[PDB]
Scaffold this active site. Structure first.
Site, short mmCIF file in Angstrom:
data_model
loop_
_atom_site.label_atom_id
_atom_site.label_comp_id
_atom_site.label_asym_id
_atom_site.label_seq_id
_atom_site.Cartn_x
_atom_site.Cartn_y
_atom_site.Cartn_z
N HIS A 1 -13.16 -6.72 -5.01
CA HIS A 1 -13.88 -7.00 -3.77
C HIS A 1 -15.14 -7.82 -4.01
CE1 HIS A 1 -11.90 -3.30 -1.61
NE2 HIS A 1 -11.03 -4.23 -1.98
N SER B 1 -9.61 -11.71 -2.84
CA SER B 1 -8.30 -12.04 -3.39
C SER B 1 -8.15 -13.53 -3.70
CB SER B 1 -7.19 -11.60 -2.44
OG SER B 1 -6.74 -10.29 -2.75
N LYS C 1 1.71 -6.46 6.87
CA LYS C 1 2.50 -7.12 5.84
C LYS C 1 2.84 -6.18 4.69
CE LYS C 1 2.57 -11.12 2.73
NZ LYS C 1 3.64 -11.91 3.41
N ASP C 2 1.87 -5.35 4.31
CA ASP C 2 2.06 -4.38 3.23
C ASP C 2 3.09 -3.32 3.59
OD1 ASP C 2 -1.29 -4.19 1.71
OD2 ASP C 2 0.09 -5.86 2.05
N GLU D 1 13.30 4.98 -21.84
CA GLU D 1 13.63 4.52 -20.50
C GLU D 1 13.46 3.01 -20.46
OE1 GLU D 1 14.86 5.89 -17.82
OE2 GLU D 1 14.17 7.95 -17.52
#
Ligand code: PEE
Ligand code: PEE
Ligand code: PEE
Ligand code: PEE
Ligand code: PEE
Ligand code: HEM
Ligand code: HEM
Ligand code: HEM
Ligand code: HEM
Ligand code: Y52
Ligand code: Y52
Ligand code: FES
Lengths: 80, 295, 380, 147, 61, 379
Positions: F201, F205, F227-228, F271
């Protein structure tokens, strides 16, 4: 900003010395201890009385509870 | 600066202002004034200096005529040995938020006129130098404190001083700043003090020496400033120190020496602090005191 | 930009603005030390707890044995168990003085700070409650039994509410495993809410004993209170290390050395000392549902403190009437602590009913009344 | 105070008293005859302590196979000529070999083969290494401690 | 003057200060332990195992 | 301050992070996986807590308690299902989260990037210790093989291992401390995430074009709040499909056989999300070199910001760096494949080359090609 926007103060001069130019624990008997008594003297008549009175309730409450365990000899005084 | 003396040499004679108290000015008598003149204005403690188109022999002749009779006793000959003045790691804060800008002076105890270290302390003081918002050099000034003062708008002005007295002195600095730029200014200033004791490079003092050379020469531009030097050189050194001699002392100063002398008078010493005006952002002697060690 | 990298660095910044350059009143006393004590005590409990948890087994057939194995076989495991157990008491001692300070110096007027405080207390009580069950001794099981069985007093929803929390029909292995998970989890919530607790505080800064504006005389946290707190730390840490390394089993019931047995009820099921006052209030009301409410009210009443302030002055320093009334309440809480440790018989029964009655009376009625009565003696 | 408290807490993660109690095993050499192979338990897994007739001390001292499948040199971890101690675990899929006949006289693993001789060296089989010999002390003389 | 010299030699420079703390702690530990163990063992004479040890080993068994 | 959304010190970092926070108008779906990781973390913690309330940390009860959870606890079979597969959803999202930053030059947010790597390292450690909890065969031997590597460290090595074990092998003293560690670490991930977002922040972004997006910023809500959530349900469908149709698709069936220290599984593989690192570990036959190569494979992310030589931030306008990027992505696939295969020819030499190219691309070719691009841009 937390230092600078605190208060509007005028006409106050303060004087202070470096810690290395003065004693850390000064005047123990001439100033320190006489006040220690003063501070104890002023508050002990407010602090102690309810605590003293609380202890009295505790002292009675315990004794009375113990007394109610003992037997009353007048119960059996005519028992044969 | 009066407050600085008042707390640095607190409890001594040097703590007094030159002009004196209001009460004293009010009540001083003709007897008191005449007493001062007779007590202090005496021949051995006086120096008749001159500079210009003057024959020295003609000078001492006119001096021999009007500067008068011999003292009788031994008391009137001897020059007094002043009682010493005690430095005090202390502060005085005279707060007035209505005052537009704040003033702060911070100093350690100096060596005195006699000490040859006073030369190095002037070389060191030349490194940090001085500034005010009319310095056209701006952000490109060689002085680190000045550059930081410009880049971050730390102060309206700052100056470094090495005011020497007979047996003592006052090595320090003074700056004028806005109420909210004080702490950052003091921060950087004390940082450059540590930088003196720790990191001083030969490149820095090679400049500082050149400035001090040009300074002492500029000090003697005219008859009055030469006479002032002469009248003071005798009164403090006991002799005249030619610019030739000053240069020899100065040219021997190197970075290793500046570090040592500064570490001697500055590092981990309890400084004297005078602060006047809107002075909230600058606070606690302990914080200032901790700024005296480790760069 | 900004000169130094202490005012700049977004990590070192709130490190700076909380523990270095943070403006604090020049005259706050030792009663302001217990804030940082609780903070360190929390980090201490979490660390000692983690070390214990790495040797603990959450199962009714292995719980008691695993704790015993920790004390007997794990290197200094006897000490870590010792510190964690007694450290839980150091937590409550500091938190009772922390609370008592605020009540006396009107710190509750920082309502957001105060309310997050109460929540921190409630989470702490729940944390110590579920941790006590972990060694699975007699007092562990029956303490868990008596307290949780209270929820069944709730009408309709109640008896289902209990058997859900139990994960069965009584306190057993499905209860121990979830209590351990709860005891592991909650301290991290306490850590988080603490950060919120301090955030709301830094809005107004600290209060002071005089209760007047301290803007005229603020000092940096470091070094004045950075040093003062550490002093207050070692001052308080000496009696408890003395407690933990000389009389370790002084505070606790010896009944917790007898492994949990659902077919033998201990003669006197009392809690640890810091729950005793609340336990006494619980048993004041003979009705099971009323007792639960009275218990909940005894702690939830702290939410009503800020709305019961009627005095024109913030603290109690210049209020002699409120002072003695305050100490009455403190002594009242002692009498409650005493009553809770005693059997439910005469005269302890009536004494408890009166002490618990006065407890709410002082807080709800006399404190706002005396405060008002004081204001008119100040000619207001 | 810091050094000690830290030291104490760091110590709480190392082996406990009960764990340390099962680190040491001692084997009375006066309880193992020639004709039977006695194997004990140590650290949860079998510990072979074999007593052989002279037909193994001599004939199996004749070590062949140019480049052995694992760096086993009898001047390394073998102290006594009449004694031999091994970790009763195959180095293939970690199973326990039986000490009857087999092929090379020594040990045979009933899982994927792996025939071990008298010295516990890997012969015919899929095992990627030899057997395993622990770090033991033998200053007891009448007994051997596998500490 | 010990005070004056302890300052200029050890406490003055931050580097020399820290080294004193380390060096001083190493010496303090070696001393404080042996002293504390001694004070504790004397306060319990003949009570500890190290005291009654000679009866059951290192001489007879 | 008019409203109580900009005022309230609690609601104001709620506002300045998820409501009024200026975000670039053109960030793509590759910027969704940030909020995915966030939700996935809160999901794993919740499903983990529910599982932990029925788990028993003991070698004689571990396997049985997990089995009891699936068989007796109401929807316990599902919570175990979601938590196990959710751990995979975490790594899928975190690999795309990382891959995004490497492609769009997001690593230039060094504080944000470095806290990211730490978050990855804590996640790997978290999933590592959680795998031991059911105490199956692959659980024990996975823990055995990996921790036994630390003994390759000179001098201090053999003590370093037996301390971590709490004994002489992986046992009950190891299981209890791994459970405590597995319980603890996700809360550290939660905390560092808050620091991770705090450093972000600072600059806000980045965007696909890699140019100043101050000319076109939009509020987080509702544009990226919506959107998320879309990106959530889009990604959550394949994994619910995975978890509710082929639950045992990803994991070794060897973990259904209770841990037995006297039987080594034929092929001890991790894994899928550890497979690439496992392959790099086995590239170096030397035990100590293998450990370093393993550590270097992930710690190399710290060197990414110092290996940026291109005059432009992203790879959008850099076709040479683009294909070189996809070479690396394909390289990681080949590594994932090699790790799942036995240590035999030709898998051995293929693994050695794939792992060699992995460091070569990151250390040498990426800063070189980037430079070569700048001179083709006439700089
Ligand atoms: C329930 C918990 C049960 C256990 C409670 C244990 C309490 C034991 C007693 C606590 C220690 C008492 C310390 C003695 C201090 C006596 C004293 O001198 O007080 C006077 C002096 C007053 O100072 P000023 O007037 O501001 O000074 C101006 C000039 N300098 O001291 C003070 O500041 C008062 C401080 C009050 C702290 C009392 C702590 C009590 C702890 C319980 C409080 C509970 C509050 C209600 C919580 C409900 C849940
Ligand atoms: C007045 C009541 C008297 C009786 C008290 C009885 C107490 C014992 C009751 C035992 C009941 C057992 C029920 C078991 C079911 C557990 C289900 C569960 O998941 O628990 C929720 C569980 C615990 O809740 P409680 O402890 O009940 O709440 C106490 C007050 N906070 O959830 C939480 O509190 C939050 C957990 C997440 C923490 C995440 C990290 C912390 C973040 C905080 C914000 C940080 C901002 C920076
Ligand atoms: C023994 C074997 C070796 C051990 C290794 C120990 C290495 C320690 C090296 C540390 C060096 C520190 C020196 C740094 C320093 O300068 O500190 C200054 C600074 C003071 O600055 P000034 O005096 O103004 O500086 C004057 C400079 N001319 O020092 C301090 O304040 C120290 C105060 C520390 C007290 C705090 C601790 C009190 C409580 C102790 C509790 C301990 C509990 C155990 C730890 C917790 C475990 C859960
Ligand atoms: C790449 C090498 C393989 C790594 C294998 C996973 C780690 C296995 C750890 C087994 C030992 C457990 C001992 C418990 C002590 C816990 C100490 C601790 O608080 O950890 C901080 C804990 C993670 O550290 P651990 O991996 O538990 O370190 C164990 C050794 N100290 O949280 C962190 O600070 C994150 C650090 C990055 C992740 C660790 C990388 C390894
Ligand atoms: C380590 C374990 C890795 C295991 C494999 C992880 C999964 C690998 C998935 C492969 C990628 C599948 C999706 C391919 C999509 C191809 C694509 O769309 O590319 C186009 C697009 C280019 O378009 P622009 O130039 O921006 O266009 C501007 C105008 N619109 O390219 C991108 O979006 C790049 C996105 C990067 C995602 C990369 C995902 C790779 C996942 C693994 C990364 C590992 C990083 C290193 C980790 C080591 C530790
Ligand atoms: C784990 C629990 C707690 C922690 C870690 C904690 C921490 C702190 C700290 C560090 C301070 C600043 C120093 C001080 O003023 O003492 C503080 C102040 C304060 N706390 Fe707490 N606290 C806790 C519990 C509580 C509780 C239970 C209450 C109220 C019921 C409360 C209410 C307050 C108030 C009102 C202040 C401001 C005091 C003042 O400045 O006058 N806190 N707290
Ligand atoms: C504010 C924080 C905490 C408080 C108040 C607290 C309180 C308690 C209490 C009162 C006990 C009872 C022990 C006894 O009397 O015998 C206990 C036990 C225990 N706690 Fe905590 N605890 C805290 C933090 C933690 C944490 C963070 C963990 C693990 C991560 C933990 C793990 C344990 C374990 C394993 C036990 C069992 C050992 C024993 O019974 O002595 N604790 N706790
Ligand atoms: C649990 C792990 C993680 C969480 C919860 C998390 C969370 C987030 C979130 C919510 C964002 C903002 C939305 C977005 O840009 O996608 C973000 C951005 C970012 N993260 Fe992470 N992240 C994690 C792991 C990582 C890792 C492993 C790295 C690097 C190796 C990293 C580096 C970055 C960078 C550089 C950005 C800025 C992206 C940009 O704006 O271009 N993070 N993270
Ligand atoms: C980022 C967070 C987490 C990750 C990546 C993670 C990962 C894992 C993994 C891979 C397993 C192996 C399960 C299997 O394959 O069979 C597991 C099991 C387990 N985890 Fe977590 N976990 C996380 C959070 C948590 C939390 C917060 C807790 C408890 C508070 C927890 C408790 C458990 C339990 C009890 C098990 C055993 C159940 C089982 O084996 O299926 N987990 N975890
Ligand atoms: C599992 O039981 C724990 C007890 C205890 O004292 O724990 C420290 C206990 C033991 C015997 C008798 C009673 C108790 C608990 S009394 C009590 N326990 C609680 C727990 C709370 O959490 C919110 C709130 C109020 C109270 S009052
Ligand atoms: C307890 O072992 C867990 C394994 C696993 O895949 O867990 C999900 C596993 C199983 C078989 C073989 C190997 C493994 C682990 S491979 C591995 N595990 C890790 C763990 C890390 O934590 C920082 C870092 C790098 C790596 S690489
Ligand atoms: S396990 Fe012995 S041969 Fe495969």
């Amino acid at each position: 900003i937390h230092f600078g926007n605190l208060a509007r103060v005028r006409h106050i001069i303060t004087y202070s010395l470096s810690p290395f130019e003065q004693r850390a624990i000064p005047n123990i008997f001439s100033d320190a201890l006489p006040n220690v008594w003063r501070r104890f003297s002023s508050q002990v008549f407010k602090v102690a009385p309810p605590f003293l009175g609380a202890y009295l309730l505790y002292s009675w409450g315990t004794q009375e509870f113990e007394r109610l365990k003992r037997k009353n000899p007048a119960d059996y005084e005519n028992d044969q | 600066f009066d407050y600085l003396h008042a707390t640095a040499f607190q409890g001594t004679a040097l703590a007094r202002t030159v002009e004196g108290t209001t009460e004293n000015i009010k009540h001083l008598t003709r007897a008191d004034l005449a007493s001062y003149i007779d007590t202090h204005f005496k021949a051995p403690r006086m120096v008749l200096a001159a500079a210009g188109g003057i024959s020295h022999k003609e000078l001492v002749d006119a001096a021999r005529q009007h500067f008068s009779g011999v003292s009788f006793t031994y008391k009137e000959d001897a020059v007094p040995i002043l009682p010493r003045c005690r430095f005090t790691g202390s502060e005085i804060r005279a707060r007035d938020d209505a005052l537009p800008v704040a003033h702060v002076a911070l100093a350690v105890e100096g060596p005195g006129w006699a000490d040859p270290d006073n030369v190095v302390l002037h070389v060191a003081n030349a490194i940090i130098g001085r500034y005010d918002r009319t310095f056209g050099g701006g952000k490109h000034l060689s002085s680190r404190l000045a550059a930081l003062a410009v880049e971050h708008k730390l102060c309206h002005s700052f100056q470094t001083f090495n005011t020497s007295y007979s047996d003592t002195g006052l090595f320090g600095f003074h700056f004028v700043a806005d109420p909210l730029s004080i702490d950052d200014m003091m921060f950087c200033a004390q940082g450059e003090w540590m930088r003196l004791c720790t990191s001083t490079t030969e490149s820095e003092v090679k400049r500082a020496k050149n400035h001090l050379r040009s300074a002492m020469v500029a000090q003697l531009d005219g008859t009055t400033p030469v006479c002032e030097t002469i009248g003071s050189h005798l009164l403090n050194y006991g002799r005249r120190i030619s610019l030739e001699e000053w240069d020899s002392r100065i040219s021997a100063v190197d970075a290793r020496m500046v570090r040592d002398v500064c570490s001697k008078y500055i590092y981990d010493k309890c400084p004297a602090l005078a602060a006047v005006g809107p002075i909230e952002q600058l606070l606690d002697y302990n914080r200032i005191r901790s700024g005296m060690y480790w760069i | 930009m900004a000169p130094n990298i202490r005012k700049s660095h977004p990590l070192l910044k709130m490190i700076n603005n909380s523990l270095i350059d943070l403006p604090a009143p020049s005259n706050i006393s030792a009663w302001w030390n217990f804030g940082s004590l609780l903070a360190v005590c929390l980090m201490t409990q979490i660390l000692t707890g983690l070390l214990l948890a790495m040797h603990y087994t959450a199962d009714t057939s292995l719980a008691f044995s695993s704790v015993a194995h920790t004390c007997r076989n794990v290197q200094y495991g006897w000490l870590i168990r010792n510190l964690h157990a007694n450290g839980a008491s150091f937590f409550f001692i500091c938190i009772f003085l922390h609370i008592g300070r605020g009540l006396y110096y009107g710190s509750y007027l920082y309502k957001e700070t105060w309310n997050t405080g109460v929540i921190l207390l409630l989470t702490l009580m729940a944390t110590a409650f579920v941790g006590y069950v972990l060694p699975w001794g007699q007092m562990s099981f029956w303490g868990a039994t008596v307290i949780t069985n209270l929820f069944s007093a709730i009408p309709y929803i109640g008896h289902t509410l209990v058997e859900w929390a139990w994960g069965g029909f009584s306190v057993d292995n499905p209860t121990l495993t979830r209590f351990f998970a709860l005891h592991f989890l909650l301290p991290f919530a306490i850590a988080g809410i603490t950060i919120i607790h301090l955030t709301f505080l830094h809005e107004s800064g600290s209060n002071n004993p005089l209760g007047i504006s301290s803007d005229s005389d603020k000092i940096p946290f470091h070094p004045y209170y950075s040093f003062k707190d550490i002093l207050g730390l070692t001052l308080m840490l000496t009696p408890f290390l003395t407690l933990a390394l000389f009389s370790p089993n002084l505070l606790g019931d010896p009944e917790n050395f007898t492994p949990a047995n659902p077919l033998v009820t201990p003669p006197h099921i009392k809690p640890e000392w810091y729950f005793l006052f609340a336990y006494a209030i619980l048993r004041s009301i003979p009705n099971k549902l009323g007792g639960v409410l009275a218990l909940a009210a005894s702690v939830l009443i702290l939410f009503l403190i800020p709305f019961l302030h009627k005095s024109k002055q913030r603290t109690m320093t210049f209020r002699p009437l409120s002072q003695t009334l305050f100490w009455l309440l403190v002594a009242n809480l002692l009498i409650l602590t005493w009553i809770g440790s005693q059997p439910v018989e005469h005269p302890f029964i009536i004494i408890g009913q009166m002490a618990s009655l006065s407890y709410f009376t002082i807080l709800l009625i006399l404190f706002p009344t005396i405060g008002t009565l004081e204001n008119k003696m100040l000619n207001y | 105070a810091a050094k000690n408290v830290v030291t104490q807490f760091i110590s709480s993660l190392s082996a406990s008293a009960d764990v340390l109690a099962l680190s040491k095993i001692e084997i009375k050499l006066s309880d193992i005859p020639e004709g039977k192979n006695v194997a004990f338990k140590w650290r949860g897994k079998p510990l072979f302590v074999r007593h052989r007739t002279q037909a193994e001390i001599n004939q199996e001292a004749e070590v062949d196979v140019s480049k052995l499948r694992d760096p086993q040199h009898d001047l390394d971890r073998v102290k006594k000529p009449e004694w031999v101690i091994l970790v009763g675990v195959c180095t293939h899929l970690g199973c326990v070999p039986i000490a009857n006949s087999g092929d090379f006289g020594g040990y045979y693993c009933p899982c994927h083969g792996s025939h071990y001789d008298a010295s516990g060296r890997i012969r015919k089989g899929p095992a990627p290494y030899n057997l395993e010999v622990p770090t033991y002390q033998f200053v007891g003389d009448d007994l051997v401690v596998v500490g | 003057a010990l005070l004056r010299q302890a300052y200029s030699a050890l406490f003055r420079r931050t580097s020399t200060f820290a080294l004193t703390v380390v060096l001083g702690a190493v010496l303090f530990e070696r001393a404080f332990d042996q002293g504390a163990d001694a004070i504790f063992e004397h306060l319990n004479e003949g009570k500890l195992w190290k005291h009654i040890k000679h009866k059951y080993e290192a001489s007879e068994e």
